[PDB]
From a paper:
Tyrosinases form an ubiquitous family of metalloenzymes and are found in all domains of life. Tyrosinases catalyze the ortho-hydroxylation of monophenols to o-diphenols (monophenolase or cresolase activity, EC 1.14.18.1) as well as the subsequent two-electron oxidation to the respective o-quinones (diphenolase or catechol oxidase activity, EC 1.10.3.1), which is coupled with the reduction of molecular oxygen to water. Activation of molecular oxygen is affected by binding of dioxygen to the type III copper center in a characteristic ‘side-on’ bridging mode (µ-η2:η2). The purity of these preparations is further compromised by the fact that Agaricus bisporus possesses genes coding for six different tyrosinases (AbPPO1 - AbPPO6).
Herein, we describe such a protocol, yielding pure AbPPO4 in its latent form as well as providing access to the mature, active form of the enzyme. Here, the latent form of AbPPO4 is produced by E. coli at a yield of 110 to 140 mg per liter of culture. ESI-MS of the acidified (causes the loss of copper)27 but otherwise intact protein yielded a mass of 65096.7 ± 0.30 Da for the latent tyrosinase which matches the calculated mass of 65096.46 Da for the complete sequence from the N-terminal glycine at position −8 to the C-terminal threonine 565 with one thioether bridge (−2.016 Da) and one closed disulfide bridge (−2.016 Da). Latent tyrosinase crystallized in the monoclinic space group C 1 2 1 with 4 chains in the asymmetric unit giving rise to a unit cell of a = 287.30 Å, b = 52.09 Å, c = 152.66 Å, α = 90.00°, β = 98.03° and γ = 90.00°. The obtained crystals diffracted to a resolution of 3.25 Å (for further statistics see Table S2). In contrast to the crystals obtained with the enzyme isolated from the natural source which contained two different chains in the asymmetric unit (one latent and one active protein)33 and did only form in the presence of sodium hexatungstotellurate(VI) (Na6[TeW6O24] • 22 H2O, TEW), the recombinant enzyme formed crystals containing exclusively the latent tyrosinase. Inspection of the electron density gave no indication for any deviation from the sequence shown in Fig. 5. The amino acid side chains which form hydrogen bonds with the TEW polyoxyanion in the crystal of the enzyme purified from the natural source (HKKE starting at H116) are found in equivalent positions in the crystal of the recombinant enzyme but the lysine side chains are considerably more flexible as indicated by the lack of electron density beyond the Cβ-atoms.
Residue numbers in the entry: 3 to 557
Write the structure that this text describes.
């Protein structure tokens, strides 16, 4: 078979998509290589179709031996809602990067002028990442431009079709026969309408709307998850107060995929065929690495298989020694989650660690902590115009030193529900209803919880580990309180949320849908900052406050 060894060459960085498109050589090589692996036949193991067929459809083994190897559970190889999510989606990007750099290495020999620079550029070609937490609105070259300007083989700037917008099937795999819409669709569709038409213009607007919420979710996900169960999966874990890596991962899949109807990107069986997928999960891997800098010594714990993949049947106990199928290091040994702590083993890194390249684990944590405080944190007011926002900035951002200890309430919208109740991907919208419920207002929009579903299991060999998984999500309210109120007291924020008529709506496709396992509430956690620390701690004096009568359902 094909061993997942990663890209060749030295240890090179995965560049930001903002900077990757400005480098002519890297962008040209990326377009050429991507079109190269796209035009190959869908039966070849090194094609875009086979690599995308690992995350979902088809339900066939990838790179398997001629000799017999039965499949334990027929589903996609993707491992979602378990402890193996980040590591599996870590090596999964490495194989795609490996073959993509192989094709680009073949294309580099097809040039004529500067044959030494264009080949070395192919040796350093790493999959760029889309920093959704900072700039949710991406550049035009990856979602909006039908044609892109690159450099031809002779050295002239030419205009070619962009292979990043979409992917044409050739042909549509018969396994998609019984799946609606996906069988009739020629190419992948982002943000579809009721007439099966791709609506990219509305998608841009949406991202521009969800920029702030995505920023806060990314920040709190990176800084306030100290254990593996609270960081890697959907599962409702005790004493949680921030989104997990997988939830923030779901937000992008739901932004690009779910429009008036369900698209490719919002279905776990067809998500990998969208070329933007690899730009998202690259940044996800970056999020993992950043988290590794903040919490060293915290890695994969043991957990059960909740929904079931092709690697493990529902009920299998998974740990750091589990086999990350179908990714192998040698022809007789599959990858495990243990060696995946060092990205340098796979010949790639990220520019966030450029300033501390070769430092102690103590210093890397401080630099990355400060870097997250400045990149995704909350800035303070100009000239002290809003003191409440300065107090909010001390807890969720850059912390100015103080003589006395500071205290405030951290407010969040917690929502818990039982996945697999409905077999359609949906979303929960939160907004203020004081102005009116018939216009999408930039200021009166809180956030949303998107659901990234796909194939559901039904039963097993009358096993016993089969337990309903509970998925939870968070939406932050602190910045909206700092804009209006002058304090974070519960007695004031109750009147703030009741006067502004904080409401929510569970929507699937276009019409409204209802589920019975949902429980939404507002949580106020007393946070205090001693005069010598910048990291907030739970205030063990005043108890946690829960409001379950403020939210309103709208249909
Ligand atoms: Cu996935
Ligand atoms: Cu994904």
């Amino acid at each position: 078979l094909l061993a997942t060894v990663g890209p060749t060459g030295g240890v090179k960085n995965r560049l930001d998509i903002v900077d990757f498109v400005r480098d002519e050589k890297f962008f040209t090589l990326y377009v050429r290589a991507l079109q190269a692996i796209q035009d190959k036949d869908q039966a070849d193991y090194s094609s875009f179709f086979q690599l995308s067929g690992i995350h979902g459809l088809p339900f066939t083994p990838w790179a398997k031996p001629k000799d017999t190897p039965t499949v334990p559970y027929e589903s996609g190889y993707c491992t979602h809602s378990q402890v193996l999510f980040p590591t599996w989606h870590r090596v999964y990007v490495s194989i795609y990067e490996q073959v993509l750099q192989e094709a680009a290495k073949g294309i580099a020999k097809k040039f004529t002028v500067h044959k030494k620079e264009w080949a070395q550029a192919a040796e350093d070609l790493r999959q760029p990442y889309w920093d959704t937490g900072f700039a949710l609105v991406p550049p035009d070259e990856i979602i909006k431009l039908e044609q892109v300007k690159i450099t031809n083989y002779d050295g002239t700037k030419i205009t070619v079709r962009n292979p990043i917008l979409r992917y044409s099937f050739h042909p549509i795999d018969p396994s998609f026969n019984g799946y609606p819409n996906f069988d009739t669709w020629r190419t992948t569709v982002r943000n579809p309408d009721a007439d099966k038409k791709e609506n990219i213009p509305a998608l841009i607007a949406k991202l521009d709307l969800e920029a702030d919420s995505t920023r806060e979710k990314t920040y709190n996900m990176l800084k306030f998850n100290a254990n593996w169960e609270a960081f890697s999966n959907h599962g409702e874990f005790d004493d949680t107060h921030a989104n997990s890596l997988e939830a923030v991962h779901d937000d992008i899949h739901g932004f690009v995929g779910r429009g008036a109807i369900r698209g490719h990107m919002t279905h776990a069986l067809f998500a990998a065929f969208d070329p933007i997928f690899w730009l998202h999960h690259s940044n996800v891997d970056r999020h993992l690495s950043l988290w590794q800098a903040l919490y060293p010594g915290v890695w994969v714990t043991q957990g059960p298989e909740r929904e079931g993949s092709m690697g493990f049947a529902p009920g299998t106990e998974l740990n750091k020694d589990s086999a990350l199928e179908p990714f192998y290091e040698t022809e007789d040994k599959p990858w495990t989650s243990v060696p995946l702590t060092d990205t340098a083993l796979l010949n790639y890194s990220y520019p966030d660690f450029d300033k501390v390249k070769g430092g102690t684990p103590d210093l890397v944590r401080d630099y990355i902590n400060d870097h997250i405080d400045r990149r995704y944190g909350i800035k303070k007011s100009e000239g002290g115009k809003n003191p409440a926002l300065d107090l909010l900035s001390d807890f969720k951002g850059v912390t100015h030193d103080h003589n006395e200890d500071l205290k405030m309430f951290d407010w969040t919208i917690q929502a818990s529900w039982k996945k697999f109740e409905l077999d359609d991907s949906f979303a929960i919208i939160f907004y203020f209803a004081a102005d009116g419920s018939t216009n999408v207002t930039k200021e009166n929009y809180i956030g949303s919880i998107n659901i990234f579903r796909g194939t559901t299991p039904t039963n097993c060999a009358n096993c016993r580990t089969q337990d309903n998984l509970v998925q939870e999500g968070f939406v932050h309210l602190d910045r909206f309180i700092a804009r209006d109120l002058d304090t974070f007291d519960p007695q004031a924020v109750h009147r703030y949320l009741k006067e502004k008529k904080l409401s929510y709506k569970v929507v699937a496709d276009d019409h409204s849908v209802t589920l019975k396992s949902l429980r939404i509430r507002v949580q106020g956690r007393p946070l205090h900052l001693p005069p010598g620390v910048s990291f907030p701690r739970l205030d063990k004096n005043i108890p946690i406050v829960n409001f379950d009568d403020v939210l309103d359902l709208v249909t």
